[PDB]
Design a protein around this motif. Structure first.
Motif, mmCIF file in Angstrom:
data_model
loop_
_atom_site.group_PDB
_atom_site.id
_atom_site.type_symbol
_atom_site.label_atom_id
_atom_site.label_comp_id
_atom_site.label_asym_id
_atom_site.label_seq_id
_atom_site.Cartn_x
_atom_site.Cartn_y
_atom_site.Cartn_z
ATOM 1 N N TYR A 1 -19.578 20.245 41.950
ATOM 2 C CA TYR A 1 -19.136 19.112 41.174
ATOM 3 C C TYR A 1 -19.467 17.837 41.931
ATOM 4 N N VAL A 2 -20.202 16.934 41.281
ATOM 5 C CA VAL A 2 -20.602 15.675 41.908
ATOM 6 C C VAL A 2 -19.893 14.537 41.187
ATOM 7 N N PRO A 3 -18.764 14.066 41.750
ATOM 8 C CA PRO A 3 -17.798 13.246 40.984
ATOM 9 C C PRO A 3 -18.193 11.801 40.699
ATOM 10 N N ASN B 1 -36.706 30.122 35.162
ATOM 11 C CA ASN B 1 -37.160 29.217 36.251
ATOM 12 C C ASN B 1 -36.016 28.381 36.850
ATOM 13 N N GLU B 2 -35.248 27.723 35.983
ATOM 14 C CA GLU B 2 -34.175 26.829 36.399
ATOM 15 C C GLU B 2 -33.260 27.512 37.401
ATOM 16 N N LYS B 3 -32.643 28.610 36.972
ATOM 17 C CA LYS B 3 -31.703 29.342 37.800
ATOM 18 C C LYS B 3 -32.359 29.982 39.025
ATOM 19 N N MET C 1 -20.023 23.658 35.807
ATOM 20 C CA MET C 1 -20.526 24.930 35.360
ATOM 21 C C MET C 1 -21.383 24.657 34.169
ATOM 22 N N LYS C 2 -22.686 24.921 34.249
ATOM 23 C CA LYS C 2 -23.556 24.823 33.069
ATOM 24 C C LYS C 2 -23.371 26.081 32.282
ATOM 25 N N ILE C 3 -23.258 25.943 30.969
ATOM 26 C CA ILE C 3 -23.166 27.087 30.056
ATOM 27 C C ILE C 3 -24.271 26.992 29.034
ATOM 28 N N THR D 1 -29.971 17.023 39.625
ATOM 29 C CA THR D 1 -29.512 18.120 38.759
ATOM 30 C C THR D 1 -30.575 18.451 37.677
ATOM 31 N N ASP D 2 -30.293 19.484 36.879
ATOM 32 C CA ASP D 2 -31.046 19.854 35.660
ATOM 33 C C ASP D 2 -32.503 20.290 35.926
ATOM 34 N N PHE D 3 -32.649 21.522 36.418
ATOM 35 C CA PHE D 3 -33.964 22.042 36.823
ATOM 36 C C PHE D 3 -34.642 22.858 35.722
ATOM 37 N N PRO E 1 -32.716 8.681 35.745
ATOM 38 C CA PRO E 1 -31.315 8.414 36.136
ATOM 39 C C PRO E 1 -30.272 9.409 35.569
ATOM 40 N N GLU E 2 -30.528 9.934 34.367
ATOM 41 C CA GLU E 2 -29.589 10.855 33.715
ATOM 42 C C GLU E 2 -29.389 12.080 34.580
ATOM 43 N N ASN E 3 -30.436 12.464 35.321
ATOM 44 C CA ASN E 3 -30.411 13.658 36.201
ATOM 45 C C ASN E 3 -30.034 13.471 37.700
ATOM 46 N N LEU E 4 -29.756 12.243 38.118
ATOM 47 C CA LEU E 4 -29.384 11.955 39.499
ATOM 48 C C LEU E 4 -27.901 11.663 39.570
ATOM 49 N N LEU F 1 -18.593 17.389 31.102
ATOM 50 C CA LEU F 1 -19.237 16.282 31.830
ATOM 51 C C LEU F 1 -20.600 15.900 31.271
ATOM 52 N N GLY F 2 -21.135 16.746 30.401
ATOM 53 C CA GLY F 2 -22.402 16.488 29.751
ATOM 54 C C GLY F 2 -22.851 17.601 28.817
ATOM 55 N N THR F 3 -23.871 17.321 28.003
ATOM 56 C CA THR F 3 -24.410 18.299 27.039
ATOM 57 C C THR F 3 -25.931 18.390 27.074
ATOM 58 N N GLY F 4 -26.421 19.438 26.423
ATOM 59 C CA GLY F 4 -27.827 19.599 26.083
ATOM 60 C C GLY F 4 -27.999 20.528 24.872
ATOM 61 N N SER F 5 -29.243 20.831 24.516
ATOM 62 C CA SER F 5 -29.535 21.584 23.274
ATOM 63 C C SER F 5 -28.800 22.912 23.219
ATOM 64 N N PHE F 6 -28.821 23.625 24.343
ATOM 65 C CA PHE F 6 -28.319 25.000 24.440
ATOM 66 C C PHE F 6 -26.889 25.133 24.952
ATOM 67 N N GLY F 7 -26.312 24.073 25.500
ATOM 68 C CA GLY F 7 -24.944 24.138 25.940
ATOM 69 C C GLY F 7 -24.428 22.862 26.571
HETATM 70 C C1 R96 Z 1 -35.778 19.566 25.900
HETATM 71 C C2 R96 Z 1 -35.166 20.818 25.255
HETATM 72 C C3 R96 Z 1 -34.646 20.375 23.864
HETATM 73 C C4 R96 Z 1 -36.173 21.941 24.990
HETATM 74 C C5 R96 Z 1 -36.848 22.338 26.304
HETATM 75 C C6 R96 Z 1 -35.877 22.692 27.464
HETATM 76 N N1 R96 Z 1 -34.489 22.145 27.391
HETATM 77 C C7 R96 Z 1 -33.505 22.646 28.316
HETATM 78 C C8 R96 Z 1 -33.903 23.314 29.487
HETATM 79 C C9 R96 Z 1 -32.940 23.809 30.369
HETATM 80 C C10 R96 Z 1 -31.585 23.632 30.117
HETATM 81 O O1 R96 Z 1 -30.774 24.131 31.083
HETATM 82 C C11 R96 Z 1 -31.156 22.961 28.945
HETATM 83 C C12 R96 Z 1 -29.787 22.709 28.477
HETATM 84 O O2 R96 Z 1 -29.466 23.214 27.380
HETATM 85 C C13 R96 Z 1 -28.814 21.825 29.116
HETATM 86 C C14 R96 Z 1 -27.438 22.001 28.888
HETATM 87 C C15 R96 Z 1 -26.542 21.127 29.501
HETATM 88 C C16 R96 Z 1 -27.021 20.078 30.308
HETATM 89 C C17 R96 Z 1 -26.093 19.149 30.913
HETATM 90 O O3 R96 Z 1 -24.995 18.923 30.396
HETATM 91 N N2 R96 Z 1 -26.463 18.469 32.069
HETATM 92 C C18 R96 Z 1 -25.760 17.222 32.476
HETATM 93 C C19 R96 Z 1 -25.912 16.086 31.415
HETATM 94 C C20 R96 Z 1 -27.360 15.634 31.132
HETATM 95 C C21 R96 Z 1 -27.872 14.691 32.240
HETATM 96 N N3 R96 Z 1 -28.071 15.421 33.491
HETATM 97 C C22 R96 Z 1 -26.818 15.553 34.254
HETATM 98 C C23 R96 Z 1 -26.129 16.887 33.970
HETATM 99 N N4 R96 Z 1 -24.920 16.900 34.817
HETATM 100 C C24 R96 Z 1 -24.811 17.729 35.920
HETATM 101 O O4 R96 Z 1 -25.695 18.560 36.089
HETATM 102 C C25 R96 Z 1 -23.667 17.579 36.820
HETATM 103 C C26 R96 Z 1 -23.498 18.447 37.898
HETATM 104 C C27 R96 Z 1 -22.424 18.278 38.768
HETATM 105 N N5 R96 Z 1 -21.529 17.316 38.557
HETATM 106 C C28 R96 Z 1 -21.645 16.455 37.540
HETATM 107 C C29 R96 Z 1 -22.711 16.565 36.658
HETATM 108 C C30 R96 Z 1 -28.387 19.899 30.512
HETATM 109 C C31 R96 Z 1 -29.277 20.773 29.910
HETATM 110 C C32 R96 Z 1 -32.130 22.467 28.068
HETATM 111 C C33 R96 Z 1 -34.053 21.346 26.191
#
Ligand code: R96
Lengths: 341, 20
Positions: free
Chosen positions: A113-115, A81-83, A62-64, A174-176, A160-163, A40-46
């Motif tokens: 899950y927020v659909p 902090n996030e968790k 599930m965030k990984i 989301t995304d703390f 908006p990406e986080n709401l 459903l989405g990505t970031g740097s670490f998973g």
């Molecule tokens: C900015 C950085 C490069 C360096 C400093 C800290 N950073 C950081 C900090 C904490 C983190 O947990 C991460 C991550 O790696 C990470 C890994 C995955 C995601 C992720 O996929 N989140 C999605 C997509 C991005 C937009 N936010 C919405 C989020 N989706 C949801 O959370 C979601 C939940 C329930 N149902 C549907 C969706 C977001 C962040 C990255 C990354």
């Protein structure tokens, strides 16, 4: 006496959060209890994936996070902090964490899950929200921030990406990853460029008032269709923010403009949210006059937009992302670092 | 228009956060 039972609600919420903050839940599930379906989405670490809990049949997100990647980028303390914060909070507009755990390779967080998909997705498709539509979301965020700041939490990545929009059209934040429990000031240069308060850009050291600046950026963006400060490179964006010259669309009502001029106030002694009356300066503001704060909290206001939802476990409100088989190493990585996870 | 400039910018996709 209106702002007297808010005081009392919040005092009991602080008590609930502290119990969970001081003794955090760990290891409440295992990876093999979940079937993975879709990213459903990505970031740097998973990533965040749709999953199905097999003992209940319930869907979750599930965030990984890959432990080695987190360490390489010096983000250990932020992911902890996030968790830690997320397992402890409880508000109607904050995504609920059900389980967390780790294995040799990864950290995992299983949330609701927020659909409805990300506000981002809808905001870009429609172009822009009308004021009553943006007001509806904006008020949910006003209350969430009132909640978080009373627990001494700064959220720091409002956009908006986080709401996420849930099945009734309400917000789930989301995304703390940048959230932090602080009394006094902090200094990390973090956030999204368009949303950074001026004091962050300048290395002043800053407080919960940067969340109110970010609220101003969001409201503008929801109501205009674009943010008040953009350019092709971050440095050009910082230059625009520090000057603080905002221009508003000709269609923004004069109330909206006045609200934004107070939220996007470079002067911390004048900025709304940060004064003697704190959050009531925002709540009693004219642009929010039609807003019934209690009815928002209780989800009794009818949303102006309910997403199409064709079954549980349907993902057509989210984009497609490239998938990748999780691999769990046979050796523990970064054990000491994430012991508290 | 400002909207046309936004749409032609590279900042209409998802925005990642920064770190020092
Ligand atoms: C900015 C950085 C490069 C360096 C400093 C800290 N950073 C950081 C900090 C904490 C983190 O947990 C991460 C991550 O790696 C990470 C890994 C995955 C995601 C992720 O996929 N989140 C999605 C997509 C991005 C937009 N936010 C919405 C989020 N989706 C949801 O959370 C979601 C939940 C329930 N149902 C549907 C969706 C977001 C962040 C990255 C990354």
């Amino acid at each position: 006496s209106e702002q007297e039972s808010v005081k009392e609600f919040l005092a009991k919420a602080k008590e609930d959060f502290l119990k969970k903050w001081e003794n955090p839940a760990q290891n409440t599930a295992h990876l093999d209890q979940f079937e993975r379906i879709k990213t459903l989405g990505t970031g740097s670490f998973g990533r965040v994936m749709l999953v199905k809990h097999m003992e209940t049949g319930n869907h979750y997100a599930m965030k990984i996070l890959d432990k080695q990647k987190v360490v390489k980028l010096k983000q250990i303390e932020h992911t902890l902090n996030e968790k830690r914060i997320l397992q402890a909070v409880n508000f109607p507009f904050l995504v609920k964490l059900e389980f967390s755990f780790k294995d040799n390779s990864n950290l995992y967080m299983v949330m609701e899950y927020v659909p409805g998909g990300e506000m981002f997705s809808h905001l870009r498709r429609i172009g822009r929200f009308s004021e009553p539509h943006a007001r509806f979301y904006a008020a949910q965020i006003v209350l969430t921030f009132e909640y978080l700041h009373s627990l001494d939490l700064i959220y720091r990545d409002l956009k908006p990406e986080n709401l996420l929009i849930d099945q009734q059209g309400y917000i789930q934040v989301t995304d703390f990853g940048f959230a932090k429990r602080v009394k006094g000031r902090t200094w990390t240069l973090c956030g999204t460029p368009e949303y950074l308060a001026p004091e962050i850009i300048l290395s002043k050291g800053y407080n919960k008032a940067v969340d109110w600046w970010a609220l101003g950026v969001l409201i503008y963006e929801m109501a205009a269709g674009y943010p008040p400060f953009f350019a092709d490179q971050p440095i050009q964006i910082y230059e625009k923010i520090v000057s603080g010259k905002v221009r508003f669309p000709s269609h923004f009502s004069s109330d909206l403009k006045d609200l934004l001029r107070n939220l996007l106030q470079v002067d911390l002694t004048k900025r709304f949210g940060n004064l003697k009356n704190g959050v009531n300066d925002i709540k009693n503001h004219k642009w929010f006059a039609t807003t019934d704060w209690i009815a928002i909290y209780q989800r009794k206001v009818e949303a102006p937009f309910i997403p199409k939802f064709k079954g549980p476990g349907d993902t057509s409100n989210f984009d497609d992302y490239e998938e990748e088989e999780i691999r769990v190493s046979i050796n523990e990585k970064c054990g000491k670092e994430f012991s508290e996870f | 228009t400002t909207y046309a400039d936004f749409i032609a910018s590279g900042r209409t996709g998802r925005r990642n956060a920064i770190h020092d």
